[PDB]
Structure formats: structure tokens, C-alpha cells
Amino acid sequence: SMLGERRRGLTDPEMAAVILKALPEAPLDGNNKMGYFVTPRWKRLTEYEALTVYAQPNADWIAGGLDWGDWTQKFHGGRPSWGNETTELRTVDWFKHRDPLRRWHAPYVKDKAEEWRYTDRFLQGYSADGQIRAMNPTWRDEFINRYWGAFLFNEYGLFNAHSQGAREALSDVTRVSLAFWGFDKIDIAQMIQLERGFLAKIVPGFDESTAVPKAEWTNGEVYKSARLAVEGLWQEVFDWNESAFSVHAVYDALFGQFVRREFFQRLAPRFGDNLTPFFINQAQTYFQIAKQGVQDLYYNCLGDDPEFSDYNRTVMRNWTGKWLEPTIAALRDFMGLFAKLPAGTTDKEEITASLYRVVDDWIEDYASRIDFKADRDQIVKAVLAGLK
Amino acid sequence: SMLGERRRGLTDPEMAAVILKALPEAPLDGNNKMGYFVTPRWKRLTEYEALTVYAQPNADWIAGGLDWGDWTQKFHGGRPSWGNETTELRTVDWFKHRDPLRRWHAPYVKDKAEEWRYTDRFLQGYSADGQIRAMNPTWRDEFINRYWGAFLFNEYGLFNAHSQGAREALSDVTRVSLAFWGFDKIDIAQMIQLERGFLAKIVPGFDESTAVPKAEWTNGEVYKSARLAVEGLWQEVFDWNESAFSVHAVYDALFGQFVRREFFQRLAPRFGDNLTPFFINQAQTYFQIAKQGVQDLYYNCLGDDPEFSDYNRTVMRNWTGKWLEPTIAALRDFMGLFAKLPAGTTDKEEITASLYRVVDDWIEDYASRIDFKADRDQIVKAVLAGL
Amino acid sequence: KLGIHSNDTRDAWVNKIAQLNTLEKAAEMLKQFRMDHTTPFRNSYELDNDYLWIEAKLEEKVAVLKARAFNEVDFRHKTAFGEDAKSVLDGTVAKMNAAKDKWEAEKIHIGFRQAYKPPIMPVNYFLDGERQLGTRLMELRNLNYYDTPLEELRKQRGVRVVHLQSP
Amino acid sequence: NRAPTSVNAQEVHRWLQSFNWDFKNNRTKYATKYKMANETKEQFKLIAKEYARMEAVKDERQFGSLQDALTRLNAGVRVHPKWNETMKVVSNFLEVGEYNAIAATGMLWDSAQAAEQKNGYLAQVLDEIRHTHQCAYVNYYFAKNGQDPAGHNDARRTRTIGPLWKGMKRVFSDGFISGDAVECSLNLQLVGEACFTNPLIVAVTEWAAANGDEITPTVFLSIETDELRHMANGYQTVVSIANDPASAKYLNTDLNNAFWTQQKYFTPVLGMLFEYGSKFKVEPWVKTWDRWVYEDWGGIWIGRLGKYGVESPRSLKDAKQDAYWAHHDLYLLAYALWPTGFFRLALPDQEEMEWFEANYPGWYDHYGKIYEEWRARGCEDPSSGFIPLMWFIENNHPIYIDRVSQVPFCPSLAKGASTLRVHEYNGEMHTFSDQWGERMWLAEPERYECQNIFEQYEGRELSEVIAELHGLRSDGKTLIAQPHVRGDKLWTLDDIKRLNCVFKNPVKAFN
Amino acid sequence: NRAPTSVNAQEVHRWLQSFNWDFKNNRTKYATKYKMANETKEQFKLIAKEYARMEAVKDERQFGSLQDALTRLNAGVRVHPKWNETMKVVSNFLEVGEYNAIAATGMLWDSAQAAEQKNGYLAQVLDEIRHTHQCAYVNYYFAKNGQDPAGHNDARRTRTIGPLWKGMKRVFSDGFISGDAVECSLNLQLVGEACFTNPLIVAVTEWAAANGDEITPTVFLSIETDELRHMANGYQTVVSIANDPASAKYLNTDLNNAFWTQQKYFTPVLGMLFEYGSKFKVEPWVKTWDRWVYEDWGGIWIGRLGKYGVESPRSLKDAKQDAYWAHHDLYLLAYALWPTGFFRLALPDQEEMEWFEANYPGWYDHYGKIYEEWRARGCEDPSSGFIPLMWFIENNHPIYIDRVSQVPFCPSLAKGASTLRVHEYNGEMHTFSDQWGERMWLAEPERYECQNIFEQYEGRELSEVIAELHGLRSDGKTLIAQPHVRGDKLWTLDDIKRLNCVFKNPVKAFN
Ligand SMILES: [Ca+2]
Ligand SMILES: [Ca+2]
Ligand SMILES: [Ca+2]
Ligand SMILES: [Fe+2]
Ligand SMILES: [Fe+2]
Ligand SMILES: [Fe+2]
Ligand SMILES: [Fe+2]
């Protein structure tokens, strides 16, 4: 019918009259601010904080929890749903973390969605404009298809390294940040495949199958140590903080940044490739967004914890030393790719300087925050040994 | 108060009861489709057409009009509010045009807003990622600041060229498209300045002032003929269709595309500059977007008009010829720019290959539509003679 | 002072813990605490309302002391008691796989948690143990889960049936 | 450093003024008596991208409310029949005002020489495009989910049948684009928007809510946010010419002509739509008009432009005297010619007649008795053979169309103004309803040659005109327009054809 | 050649299964009796970008409705008082289910070895984050725009005061993440969402609409569009492990346990919130339950999985038997302990008692009379010095807390199940209300050590507990919880203190 059968209390005269009559003259409490008891990180409580903090039902025996008592149902054996035992790091309050970009679900999918629709417009403008014509064939078929393509597996592995953290994170704010750090990694892996799929449509003979990139990743030499590092970070680490910390403040900060920015972002343009840098721009944007969250949790909150600062830094230094070696190895093997480039593409000085840029940024943005005594020339020298 | 003093008919019991009692049992007409009388361009009538087609109150004496009678108030002298007299082109119906992208205001600002916000994010990452470190200093302080900046006055002038069309367009579908074509142009010019302003923030001695790039545009040699072609397309043309056609299907399709795509988009990368291409990606996405609309209006609608097909093609062939000359001239002057590039940056073989890309794309996308027989070799030579 | 989140019992233990300034002493107190106050096999339920919280405070002290006393290799691979974590993990898993029944298996898993829960054993090894031990324990427990009548199960568990009611 | 850095609209707009450069033919392509200073600035420092973002955000809310909650609440249906009809006119008529405003601001953009002033008009060009689609969406939504789609679904062509549409085009179409750019600027921004449109948009959301319509408020309140921006443009138009000597000689006459032009239509039409097109009332139009025109506009607003030589319209007092009964006088004509519209009209019910008398002493003795007479005679029943136009003929009350404003007027019956000036010139008769419009035509005869409905429909039988201009509902038999708002006894083309109504040009009575 | 081309989600997803690679330690980090098939596929072919877009579109409509139209209609206020309170519980409790579901699916993502199955769980991880923020927004909106913000504004901490919260954490927190990943999946997807959550979400929008709440329908209906995809995951879990020998051995046992766990809490609690937390009723819980559990789920949905070895839960019969009076038995306890909540409760009014009696013969003779006596004792008046708990003490009706489900029960008064099992084990007493939960504890003692409110509050005076756990309004004196939903005569902390109620552990009576 035009009016329908279901009557609604907001618009149905009879029902609304009943509702209005039972209403108080004014609110039964003037404090209309949900989350008013949450300590604001900034001047005033944000929507991000109100909708997120304390969503996790932790009891007080897990630093910062407001509830009481044991969990209602635990694992066979007794393991608690969530517990202090799942990570070496300690803190006065697990709810202190704040994503500097204040991303809750809505803003997060909004931004990614904008990037998706624009990406689609870009590709249609790129293909319609015929810009593929000026791209060097060898760079396209060999370096983008095989080597950039193989890197998708690196990002995919880092993505998966977040699975256990999504389950064990000790607070809502950390869980949401971790979830988003991981989701951005799978996105990048999918954008690498997206590009390969795009190229397969505008370039006759280009095979989008992942067989070649995957064989490179699983059996090649250039990415051997990288893969060995990812396999360890993902499946040999059972501590959710060691995982996130080592991935973002060690491995991806050195190896990832070198591959994405100092190799592909830096050289693609020299071969008429504006396609790959479009996607790397997204990856770097994501990297920098995650860095802020990674720094707030590990440095601002844990590394500078009023009671466990010294302990946490000792532990993170331990982790940095543990994963720095496998990371140098990954970089060392990757050096092998430079010998594959057409003569005159780049030289040892350029490579070394770019290596120093990544190491210096790492020391500034991460190592120094926990007093890890990194020796930049020793690190670079160790990596350069891989130059064939 | 908690409930407020204003009573609303949808929720107020008394008022709502009165409204419900007055309602008919069922809708007084089953045709709930606004714009149902509009001829669908596609399988089914789109929201784009329903909300746009026939908004312009034209009378039947303006090809396609549905209204009748003269205008209520005209200019001193008798000039009509809108009239056939404002353009050489003729057609069976001015409402035939359709934007292939079906852009009405909502989708239009949605797309540009996404681009604005992503742009903001890109810059924040770029600066945080220190990517500026690998950019060539000379290319930055000389070719991006002076020559790329100067080009913003070109796009700006092309933007203004649309002012009259925004007033004289003879239909809603054509007015909306024209408006967007022009707005995108001013956007590009503003994006060129945004980059210069960005560089200024991350490069200690960089000056964002338009003084240098403006003087280059106003008194330089590189864009001399370019500026002359812009001042003409904008202020010497009084025919809204000639302006739009000549700007998008001639000048910007040749000169504009060469400068944006073949010069900066092609050379910037070689100087470790992924910044500029980020914005040129937008300008090109925009160009290709506007192209579909330009083609549908002048070729699909006018050029192939069931009654004035020959007539219009003649007029557009005339305009093509009329402006193909100032365009080729603008290109020549631009050629002198390569000489200022560092040795080994590019050779004559590459530019000739790029020039033909612009010319060939032009012939395939525009010239061939109106049967304009252009000679690819002679054009390339006249331009190439500027080196 | 008898609050939920703050009371005399909790304060008393905070003071007790403040005096554990040696790793061996602190670690031993933590294990003893776990034997006395955790799991259904705890020696007593006297600290039922505060043991979870006190245990965490005790863990903090052991952790802090272990990080200061151990070199980097030992912090990653040894227990607070100086045992080799891998050896303990493997030895416990071996016993679990040799478990004859679900009753033997539960004692192995539960006891493992009481003795090695971080910061005694490094988290990496501990959670790897949870993974392996929990699997076997469930496999043994969930087989023919409903075959034993409640009357007989109560006897197997060894509870003292205090009161039974039925409509 | 590497600190996250970016650039905002303001930082780019900082250099927008320098975007324009000098050269021989850098001048307006339109005839004008004024000189807009090329150093003129705009109030809002926007660039195309930020503009899109702030508007995109508004669309989000608006469309979200419409497609979701409002639709779930059946908001398109639970509206008073009279209001559903009134919104067909309000939304579509304003739509054309929004649409011509695009061309008008495009013309103003061409006029401005300063880059910033051009940018200001440009932002409005885009806004007017959004408003065009917003007004379109309202009709679109009521057509899709309302109690009567006819009219909402085809107003763009069915509006050409009636006389009220001619006057709307004068103030919101031709008035916005035909003439000196500055004159148009005054019709659009200084008067149209500042005096009427803006207060009106808000008022409409108020009358809408009272009558159960939550669709219009959702859209119109959004349009309003944009309009608070266009005020700066109209204001800056004056600041841009205040220094030119021509201004002191022309500004005030163009303004006065602009004021009269706008009020001539809205004074009667808006009051009519509000008071007669609703069930629940918000406020008497006499009170509203005085506040809007005299207090707010003619007083405060205009008063602030005095430093720029701007004077209160000389025709102001004249407008106030002709105002009181204007809307009441016009509804009699609109209803008498009900078969020429694209909406359904209703006569005042008992509660309403009491409201009218209470607020307009004397209303019942004139208008009330007439309506009851028409109703008892069966003007609502298709079997009566009676259309109120007949009563006007029988009682010798000719209805004329002002040659300038296109506003219908009946001097022999009007309780308001009753002056009538009839002139012949080069074989053509002309009818004027006031001294200001008469001058306009006398001084500028070639600007006003619009044919009226009696001239075009002369000798034509009513049903033929309706059928030819598609004034029918889906069934091809029932009229879109109706003399009542009930769901039964709807008039058909046949009911009209039987009346044997044939239009005559009333001016020929003078020979 | 230069035709505008792009790439969509399905085109990339075609190769997603190949993203995972083999290596010795590529295995789940969690204990499990099952093995998930390495080549399991997922129903939807999504990638991160496309997932974000489709969700972003939903947010647009949702928030647009909430911020614009709904706010303009004062939709946050015009809701029945009883329902405003019901939503404090409904939205915050469901919020925790959404939250733990994030961790639960992160655990399933770790469990799956096939890239596509991981990706299916991944989309749910992101959806449950959205749902957490959505439920949060409902409380956020009612706190900001409603008639009583208390409880809506701090439920995350005030829910810890009461006993109903403990049971919620069992079925919607711990039940989702503690145990074999497959057991958790059954509690979450196969039982939780399929049997209760999804039907519940829809039902709530109906009860909400009937009681004036258009906020919840706007949010929950959107949550619902996402849940349609989470069904594929639950179904895929069973498929991924069906070809493994372990399945025939353990699947039906974990499912039966999962079924009893969920039903044990929702059978009495959902019916309680629906029937007692509303003015206008939509449907009797008795018929709603039987259709949801017995017909839809335990018949249609469960039957389809027969081809995988899945059987109807062996405890289904008992569940139905104990279901009839369950929610009625529980409201007596919830109202009796009203001072421990974060919401206001109301006694059934005359009309409601008729409905209850009409739909549940015998309700009046049992519950009806009891409420009438409590009313007579002054349970609604602050100066009465009476709390229903006192009535239970006077009539020797101890209230126990099930050690496993945390569900409160009073066997000596209940019309439903009256079973009570008390065991002593290693120095601790344990109370069970059914034979299924008892087996769970006997077999898995170390999984269930949750201390109950009587154990934690033993020897504590009531007002001290409420004060310590912040159960007060902004004035720092009036209680958040109330024994009535009227705007006057609200109980204060002092009214509670004067009652001098001191908790005692009822199990200590046993020797
Ligand atoms: Ca090797
Ligand atoms: Ca060199
Ligand atoms: Ca005893
Ligand atoms: Fe407007
Ligand atoms: Fe406007
Ligand atoms: Fe959910
Ligand atoms: Fe779900």
C-alpha cells in the first residue's frame, strides 16, 4: 500500500502521543558526552577516542583495564582470552596508544575508497592517453613483471605477520592500528597485481599470471634472504609486539623502504615508467601513515613508559639486533638485482648514497628512539658486499 | 527545550493525523518517473539526464526548445536572452548532447574532492618520505618554477575562454559540460601553483611568487606565440562554440598536450621528479575526460547532425584551419625551450617521435571526425623548424 | 580498605613485591605464587579475588629484573631460572605426546603454565607450547565427550557432590 | 626535516589575483555602463578543489538522509496534498532561477576584470549548477515517492501552459541575464537573492515542515549554506563600480528598476503559494513581507551600501501600497484559470477562511463569499460544467497580462491596485498595471515584446491547448491540473472540452 | 588501442589464491584439533580497495541520515523511555560481540591456510571493527541527543557492576576467542550470528521502530548488509575441515557445546529485553524463539550442512524445554538487582500484564502477583527502604550464578528449570544450573574459573560497590540505575546506603 502496514512510533499519531506523554521534561543527566571518563590525548576528546577506547573488556589485571575478575571461558589448559603472557613488553596502561591520524573505521575506508576510485580514473586516463608507448620494454617485461611483481609476496607476507596480533593485541586502540597496518600491506600486494593486470590489457603478450613473479620469490636469488626474513617474522614470532615492531621499525623500514623508494621509485622514471610510481606513491603514503602509529605505540607509549621505559627499550633493542641481521641479509641479496640492469642505469656511488639515505632515516626515525647504537657505515658496508 | 517549540507535520500527532486523513488511497498517477518524456541516450533514462535535460527554458524557436513565445525581458536593442544568433553552428536540437561521463554537479564535486584529499595525503607522505632528495636542482629551480609555472597562465587563459559560453550556451547539457571543462582548467592552473607552493615549503630557498613565471609568460620567448593564441581564443572569439571547439579540439589538443605530456610528463621523471607528474596525471585524466564530451558535442551531435552535418563540418573545418596556424606557431616558440635543457637530456629523434604522437593522436581523435585533411609531416616540420 | 580494584591485600602484595630485588628470588616467588593461587589445582582459594592482579604485579618485577640480568641471547632463549627454553618446550611436548589419557594430559598442560608462564619462559616458546600442548589436550578430551554419565564423571573428576536438585 | 607537509586553498589563492595579465583586448564582451575595478578582491579564498570538497560533504549528508532514513519513514508520501502540489511550483520555478543564475554569474565572471572577483562569480556559477540539480532532485524525489507525480515529473514542459510561468521567467530567467551585466547583478544578487530568494528558501523549509514535508528542508537548508556565500558577490559587484563616475548616474535607477521587477512578481506569488498552497500556516504574509522588504532589505541591508551611493528604491512606498491584497487578488485568477496549470489547487476550508479573516479583516466579504459561491455552483465537480473563468466573463471582469512583468491582473475586481493603462503602438495594443512597468516599456519598447497567453491562445478552445501542450496524466485522459486536491472526481480533457471555452484577447475590447 | 581501460577487484582476486607459498613453518600458531583445507575458496572476490569503497558508501547514507534529517526530527529524543534504556544494554553488549569478533576472525585468518579463506576472514575482521564503531555510535548518539545519557555515555565501565554483563562476555567475548579456533567459529558464525545475531539485528530494528527509535534501524540495518557476507565464512569453516578424519570425531561435539553456550544466554536475555524493555510489543518471544532456533536454524540452516557430517545439536530438546519461562524467570532477578545495572527498569503496567498473561498462561499467578507485592512494598519509591532483593532474602529464595554460563538463576522460585548442582572441588564450591554446563566444568575445570558477583562483592555493602565502580550520574549522587523509568523521584546513593544491603555468597550456606 502507499502508507504500508507497519506503524512507526516516530510518525504514527497514536503511538507517538503515547511516547511523548511518557517523556521527562528534560534529560535525566546533562552529561551528554559518551566517553567523558576517557583521558583525552589532545585538547578535547575526539570521536576517534570516544568510539574506540575501552571497547576491549579487559579487567584491571591487564594494565589499564576497567573491568574485574577472570575471563568467563578460557582455552583448554587455562590460557586467558587475552593476557599479559602474550607479549614481553609491559606498560602502565595498554589503552594509552593513539593513532596520530585518529583513524576509526569510517575515516579509514573513506580514504582508501577515494584512492580506489581515483586509481581507476587514473588508469583510464593513462590508457586512453597512450602513455604506455614511452615505457622501456625491458624495464616493463623484466623488472616490473618479474621483480616488482615478486615484491608483492614480500608485502603479502608482512600482511600475514599481523594475523596473530589481530587476535592478541591487548587494547582496542592497538588492535585497530594493527588491523589497519596489516590491511594496508595486503592492499599494496593487490596493487602490484593490479598493475600487472592493467599492463596485460594494454600490452599484447603481457602475462598477468603470478607464476613468474612467484617463482622469482620462492626460488630466485635476489629475494632469497628477504623471503627467509618474511617467513620468520610471520611464522616464527609468537609475540604480537615483536611482530609489529620488527616488521615496521626494522625490516620494512630498511628493506621495504630501499626496494620501494630507492630502487623502483627511483629507477622506474628513468625508463619512462610513470605507472609503477603511481602505485608506489600509495605504498609510501601508507608507510608514512603507519610510521606515525608505530612510533606512538612503541616509542611514545612503551619506550617512554613512566615505569617500564628502561625495560621496554632493552627489549626493543634486543629485537632490533635480532632482526637487523636478517634484514641486512635481505638487502645484501637484493643488491644482486643491480647487475641485471642495462649498463649505465646507475652506479655504485648512487646505490651507496641511496643505501645511506634509508639507513640514516631509519636511525633518525627508529633506532635512536630506543638508544640502539647503529653504525651506519658498518651496516652499508655489510650490504654492499652483495653487489655482483 | 528538549522537544523544541516547533511542531512538525511528519511527527506531530495532531498535524500528522490531519495530513493522513487528507491523503488519497493510492498515488494519483502511476508514472513516478521525472523526465520520462526525455529521449534516453542509453538503454534507460539516467539520473544525469532526468535532472538536467530541459532545465533551460528555451522556446521552440531555438532548435529543441519546448517552450513558446519570446523572452519576457531582453537586452537594450532587442537581443534575446538566448538565441541562435550567438553561434554559427546549427542543429535540429540543442539538447541532444550527452556527457559520456554523465556528470551532473554531485558526481563532479565528488570526484574532484577525492582527488583533493588524496592530493593532500600524497604531499604529506612525499615530504615525510624525503623523496625531494633525489630531484635535480636545476630542473626544480628553473624548469618547474619558471617554465612549468608560466604554463599556469596558459591554462588560466583557456579557463577564462569559457566565460562567454557559460552565458550563451544554448542548452543545459551543453552548459554543464562547458562549465566543467572550464573549471577543470582553472583547477590545473591552481595545481601548478600548489606544487610551487609545496616546493617552497620543503626547499628553503624556493620562492612561490608568480613573479618569475608570470614575467616568463608575459615577456618570454618560449610561450610568446602560446600567449598570443590564448589572448585570441579568449577575447577575440565571440562565438561560444568556436571558443570551445578551437580550445579543446585544436589548440589544447596540440600545444597543450605536447607541453604537458611530451615535455614535462616525459622529461620530469629523468630528473628525479615524481612530484610534477603527480599533478600532470590529474591534468591528463581531466583532458581525456573533457575529450569525450567535446567529441560527443561537435562530432556525434553537430558534426553528424541529421540536417546540418555538412554545414557544421564546414564551419569546424574552417575554425580548425583558422586556429591550426596560431597553434603550430605556439609550438614552434616552445621548441626553443629544449635548447636550455642540460646536454644529453633529449635528442631530435625523441621529440620528432613525441611530436608525431601529439599530431597523430589529434588526427585520429579530432581532425578525421570533420573530414579535415591534415598533413602530419608538414605540421611536424613547421614545428620542428623551431629548434 | 576492602575495594574491588584497591584493597589492603593488594597493597600488602605491592610492598612484598617491592622487596624482590634479585631475579632468582623474584622468579621463585612468582612460581610459588602460581602454585599457591592459580588454576583449579591451586593450594588455596584465599586470594581468589586478587590473585590475577597480584600475579601481574609480580610478573612485572621478574620481567624488569630478567632484562637487567640477562644478556640478549639468554633473554630470548633462556627461562628466568636459567633453563634452555627450547629444551623445556620440547621435553614438555614429548611428555604430552606420551600422555596415556586426558587426565594425564591436563596435568601436563596446566602444570606447564604454572611453572613457565612468561616472564619465566620467553613468550615465543611459551605460546608455541600452548599451540602444541593445547592441541593434544583437546584431542584427548573431546573424544567421546558425552559417553561418560555425569554420575561417573563427577567421580572421575573427584568432586564432592554437595547437593543435587531435580524437578 | 621530513615533517608531513602540504598546501591549502588559501596558500594558493594568495597568488590568484596575479593570474590575470594585461593585453589589448582584455575586456568584457558584454555591453555595460560601468567599470568594475581590476583590483577588486573576493571574501572567500577558495580554489576549485577545496570548493568541490566542501560541497561534496554537503551532498553526502543530504542524499544520505534522502535515500535512507527519509525514504524509510515514507517522507515522500506523508505530506499534505496541498503541499505536495505547491512543491511542484516552488521547486521547479526556483529551479529555473537557479539555472539562469548559472548564465548570469557566467556573464558576471566575464564582466569582472580582477582575477579574484572572477573567481568569486565562478564559485557561484558552480553553486547555481548544484542548486539547479537540487531543485530538480526535489521534484524527482516527490515524483518517485509521492502521492501525485504528475507535474513533478514533467514541469519542465507542462509549466508552459500557464500564465504564472511567464512572470517567473521575467524575474528569474530573463531578468538575470538580459541587460547591462550590472542590472542583471542587481536583479539576481542585490535584490532577488538578498531581498527574496534567501529569506524565501528558509521560509519554505518552515512551511514544508509544518505540512509534513521533510524532503524539501533536507535539500533547501543545504542550498541555503551556499547562498550565504553569494551575498558577498552581489555586495562586491557594487564595491567594484562604486568608484566609476557612471555609477552615481546609473546605479540607483538600475537598482530601483531591479527592485520593482522582483517584488512585482514575488509580492503576490509567494504570499499566494504560502497561504493558499498549505493547510498549516506558519505566519501571515503581510507580516512576513514587511519584515523582509521594509525592515531587513530596504532598511538594514540597503542601508549598509549607502557609503557606496546606493539609495533606497524610489518605488518602495509604491510597492508597499500595492502589496497588502496582491496575493489574495492573484489567487482568484490562478484558481479561475486552474485548467492551465500543472498542479492541483484547493479552495480555503472553514478553518482557513477564519484564519484569513482574522489576519486580513475584510477578506471574507470579498474573497470568501466568491469562493463559496463558486463551490456551491460546483467548481469542484466536473459534472457542473463550471470553470471560474466563466464567472469573470459573466460579471464583466476582464483579466489582463502586464506587458512588462507578465503578472495577471483584474482591475475591475481587485481589492488592491486597479490602475490600467492601455496604449497602441505601431499596430499593437499594450496593457500595463503600474507606472514603473509602463515607463520601462515606454523607454525600452524593444526589450518587452513577450506575447501573453490570450494572444497565443486567442481563438483556441481550452482543451486543445491543454492536449497539445501535454497537460494530461499517464492515462492520457485526466488533467494534471485540478480544482480540488481529493483523490476522486478528477476532471478529464472531456470535461473541459464540453465547457466550450475559447480564449479571447481582452485588449481588443477597446478595439 | 588507446581505449579507456582499467582493472576491477575480481580481476585481481583471480590470482589471490596464489599469494600464499610453502615453507616448513607455514602453519597456524593456534591449537586446534582440525585441519583447514589448503585449497578452500571464498564466496566474494574482494580486494582491500573495493572493500573500502562498498563500506564507505554505506557509511555515507548512514551518517548522513543521523547527522541531518534524524537530528532535525529530534529522533534521539522521541523514543519511549523504556526503549531508550533497553538500547543502552542492547547496543553496548552487542558492541563487545562485534569487538571480540574482530579478534576471533583474526584468529580464523591465522587458522586458514588457503589465501582465499584467509581473505574471507580478513573482510570480516574489518567488518567487525566497523560494527564495533557502529554500536558505539548508537550509544554515542543517544547520549548526545537523548532523554537519558547516563549509561549510554559510560557503559564500557558501568556494565561491570552488574551480573548480566558476565554472561554477555561468555557468549560474545570469551566464547568467540578462547578455545579451538573451530569451536570459536561455531560460537561466532555457525551458531552466534546464524542462529541469534542476524535474526536479532533485524528484530531490534522492528522493536526499535515500534517504540519511536529510528536511530538504531539506520545503523543496524547497515550492519545487517555486512553480516550477509559473514555467513559464507562460517559455512566455509565447516567445508574447509569436513574432509579431515578429525571432523567426524569432534565437529558435532564442539557444535553442541557452542549451541548450548549461546542459547543458554540469549534464550532468557533477548526475550527479557524485548518484552520487558519495551512499551509497544512486536511479537511474543515464545513464538519468535521457536521460529529462530527450532525452525530456521535447527532445521533449515543446520540441515543444509548434513552433507558435511553436521547434526542437530543433541541438547536442542532440553533447550526448548527450559526456554518457555526463562526470560520471565530472569527479569525477576534483573529487576530485583536493579541497583547493580547501568539502566532504568520498569515494572509491568496493567496493560502489559494482560499481554503477558494472554501470551503466557499462568504468568499472572506467578510473576504478576510478585511484581504487585514489590510495588506494594514500595520498590519504586526511594523512601520505602525496599529493594526486591530483600524479598528474596525474606522468602528464602537464594540467587545463584552458574559457574559456566554466568547466567543468574533462582531454582526455588523459577517456573522454568529448577535444577541445581553443587560441587566442592579442591577447596572451592561450584553451582550449576544444567547438565550441559556441568559436564563442561567437570571435563574442563580450568576453562571456567570466573568469579561471580557474590564472590567478589561478598561482605560488601551495596552502596560502596556502586560508588567504587562509578555507578552514579553527573551530579555524583543520583544512581544511574532506577527501579522505574519516570523523570521524578530518582533514587540516590544515600537511599541505597540506608537499606544497608550487604552481599553474601549463597553457596556458603552449604556444608
Ligand atoms: Ca644467494
Ligand atoms: Ca657517477
Ligand atoms: Ca564444608
Ligand atoms: Fe542558488
Ligand atoms: Fe545564489
Ligand atoms: Fe558484526
Ligand atoms: Fe559478523
Curated annotation (Swiss-Prot), chain B:
It holds the Pfam family Phenol_Hydrox. Signal peptide: none annotated. It comes from the Bacteria. Keywords: Monooxygenase, NADP, One-carbon metabolism, Oxidoreductase. It catalyses: methane + NADH + O2 + H(+) = methanol + NAD(+) + H2O; methane + NADPH + O2 + H(+) = methanol + NADP(+) + H2O. InterPro entries: Ferritin-like_SF, MethMoxA_beta, MP_mOase_hydro, Phenol_Hydrox, RNR-like. One of its GO terms (molecular function) is methane monooxygenase [NAD(P)H] activity. SUPFAM superfamilies: Ferritin-like (SSF47240). GO terms for biological process: one-carbon metabolic process. Its EC number is 1.14.13.25. Responsible for the initial oxygenation of methane to methanol in methanotrophs. It also catalyzes the monohydroxylation of a variety of unactivated alkenes, alicyclic, aromatic and heterocyclic compounds. M.capsulatus has two forms of methane monooxygenase, a soluble and a membrane-bound type. The soluble type consists of four components (A to D): protein A, comprising three chains, in an alpha-2, beta-2, gamma-2 configuration, is a nonheme iron protein containing an unusual mu-hydroxo bridge structure at its active site and interacts with both oxygen and methane. This is Methane monooxygenase component A beta chain. The gene is mmoY.
Curated annotation (Swiss-Prot), chain C:
It comes from the Bacteria. Signal peptide: none annotated. This is Methane monooxygenase component A gamma chain. Its EC number is 1.14.13.25. SUPFAM superfamilies: Methane monooxygenase hydrolase, gamma subunit (SSF47152). GO terms for molecular function: methane monooxygenase [NAD(P)H] activity. It catalyses: methane + NADH + O2 + H(+) = methanol + NAD(+) + H2O; methane + NADPH + O2 + H(+) = methanol + NADP(+) + H2O. Responsible for the initial oxygenation of methane to methanol in methanotrophs. It also catalyzes the monohydroxylation of a variety of unactivated alkenes, alicyclic, aromatic and heterocyclic compounds. Keywords: Monooxygenase, NADP, One-carbon metabolism, Oxidoreductase.
Swiss-Prot record, chains D, E:
Fe cation 2 binds at residues 193, 227, 230. GO terms for biological process: one-carbon metabolic process. The active site is at 135. Binds 2 iron ions. Its EC number is 1.14.13.25. It is an enzyme of class 1 (oxidoreductase). Its cofactor is Fe cation. One of its GO terms (molecular function) is methane monooxygenase [NAD(P)H] activity. Fe cation 1 binds at residues 98, 128, 131. It catalyses: methane + NADH + O2 + H(+) = methanol + NAD(+) + H2O; methane + NADPH + O2 + H(+) = methanol + NADP(+) + H2O. Keywords: Iron, Metal-binding, Monooxygenase, NADP, One-carbon metabolism, Oxidoreductase. Responsible for the initial oxygenation of methane to methanol in methanotrophs. It also catalyzes the monohydroxylation of a variety of unactivated alkenes, alicyclic, aromatic and heterocyclic compounds. M.capsulatus has two forms of methane monooxygenase, a soluble and a membrane-bound type. The soluble type consists of four components (A to D): protein A, comprising three chains, in an alpha-2, beta-2, gamma-2 configuration, is a nonheme iron protein containing an unusual mu-hydroxo bridge structure at its active site and interacts with both oxygen and methane. Belongs to the TmoA/XamoA family. This is Methane monooxygenase component A alpha chain.
